[PDB]
């Protein structure tokens, strides 16, 4: 089975600049003086969409900002200029030999200026406590770049178990990311402590970004 190696795993490109993605097939996808290399763009929740077929030919309604190149085992997708709508997964795909095989895919994101996250912390609702559980919720919204780590502290001591994180993809309007972090405890443990802290480390600051409340 043909293995397609894509690179990089993800890249961030500024509006107007050039995005280049590479695909290395473990083996030649040439037959009949034709390279059977295809490129797909997939936006979240949507089916893939063919960009380039047979290495260098446009898909229907695919503008010339998208161009493929290459022969044999080395292929490239060029996007120039990159536009706001281009954030997506990009897959190369070979139709030289059965089984048809895809690269693992490259995530393209729009590079924008830095943005500190807006952090919000919420104690468990009194409704939730009547069921015996307690979730403390932290929203870290509208930040860039995407890299971020969240730590929880209870009366100042770090708590790692019971933490659930979820993230959004890059917002198509302002190009930021958002993150939800939920610390769940029993009602009884929750009510034994006072101070709850959501702590984020982000490029925006050398120091942790801290939001807390006292159960008082």
């Amino acid at each position: 089975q043909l293995v397609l190696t894509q690179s990089p795993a993800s890249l961030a490109v500024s509006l107007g600049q050039r995005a280049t993605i590479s695909c290395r097939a473990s083996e030649s996808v040439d037959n009949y003086g034709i390279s059977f290399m295809n490129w797909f763009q997939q936006k979240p929740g949507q089916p893939p969409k063919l960009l380039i077929h047979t290495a260098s030919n446009q898909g229907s309604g695919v503008p010339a900002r998208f161009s493929g190149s290459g022969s044999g085992t080395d292929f490239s997708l060029n996007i120039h200029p990159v536009e706001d709508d281009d954030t997506a997964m990009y897959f190369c795909q070979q139709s030289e030999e059965v089984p048809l095989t895809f690269g693992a895919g490259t995530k393209l994101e729009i590079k924008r200026t830095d943005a500190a996250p807006t952090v919000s912390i919420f104690p468990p609702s009194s409704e939730q406590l009547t069921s015996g559980g307690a979730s403390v919720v932290c929203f870290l919204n509208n930040f860039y770049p995407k890299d971020i780590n969240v730590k929880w502290k209870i009366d100042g001591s770090e708590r790692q178990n019971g933490v659930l994180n979820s993230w959004t993809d890059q917002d198509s309007k302002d190009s930021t990311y958002s993150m939800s972090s939920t610390l769940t405890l029993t009602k009884d443990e929750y009510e034994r402590h006072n101070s709850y802290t959501c702590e984020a480390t982000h490029k925006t600051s050398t120091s942790p970004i801290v939001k807390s409340f006292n159960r008082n």
């Binding site: 037959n31 089916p47 063919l50 919420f122 609702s125 409704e127 939730q128 979730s135 979820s166």
Partner: protein, 210 residues
């Protein structure tokens, strides 16, 4: 050109699904139809194709046995029967026009198969209450996906973040935040509207100050 795929399915392990793909806008006799699998956050695996004019099939060895692909030429429809289903076959399944040397230029919208032992369970909905003010909604303990969340019946759209659901302990949890001007709340109502079709549940939670 269109490929209309059948609706999503929740089945138990050891079962079999019949996925369908109704096509129009091209000569069906003359084209290849491929079936593909894609797990959340992963790449695509090609399962099989059928050439509609002859009904001949080619299968990816990684799935052979599990998949059977046919066409009904009278109705421009392709089928895939996918049997001995396990939890690891939970994924989105696509049909696409293409196969052999022909790139896959038109795609169906995807059919979401979930293979689980877990029972349908309705969500618990919790208000998150605290210049801009952030409010929220916590939706916990439901199955299967999806639940949807809107604010103010879908009229409150800007400043909303709805986060992908995460599965823990065979039940899903998701959250949604909304940020509004502080002059606007609590003077004006903000309500979380949660829908879980699988359990025929609709829940409206008004966010009121603590």
């Amino acid at each position: 050109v269109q490929l209309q795929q059948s609706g999503g399915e929740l089945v138990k392990p050891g079962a079999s699904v019949k996925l369908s793909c109704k096509t129009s806008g091209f000569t069906f006799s003359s084209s290849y139809i491929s079936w593909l699998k894609q797990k959340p956050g992963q790449s695509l695996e090609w399962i099989a194709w059928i050439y509609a004019g002859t009904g001949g099939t080619e299968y990816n060895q990684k799935f052979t046995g599990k998949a059977q692909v046919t066409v009904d030429t009278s109705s421009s429809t392709a089928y895939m029967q996918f049997s001995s289903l396990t939890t690891e076959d939970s994924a989105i399944y696509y049909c696409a026009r293409g196969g052999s040397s022909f790139a896959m230029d038109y795609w169906g919208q995807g059919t979401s198969v979930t293979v689980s032992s877990a029972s349908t369970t309705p969500p618990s909905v919790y208000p998150l209450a605290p210049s801009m003010v952030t409010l929220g909604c916590l939706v916990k303990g439901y199955f299967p996906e999806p639940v949807t969340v809107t604010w103010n019946s879908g009229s409150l759209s800007s400043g909303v973040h709805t986060f992908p659901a995460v599965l823990q302990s065979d039940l899903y949890t998701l959250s949604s935040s909304v940020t509004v001007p502080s002059s606007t709340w609590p003077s004006e109502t903000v309500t979380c509207n949660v829908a879980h079709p699988a359990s025929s549940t609709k829940v409206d939670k008004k966010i009121v100050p603590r």
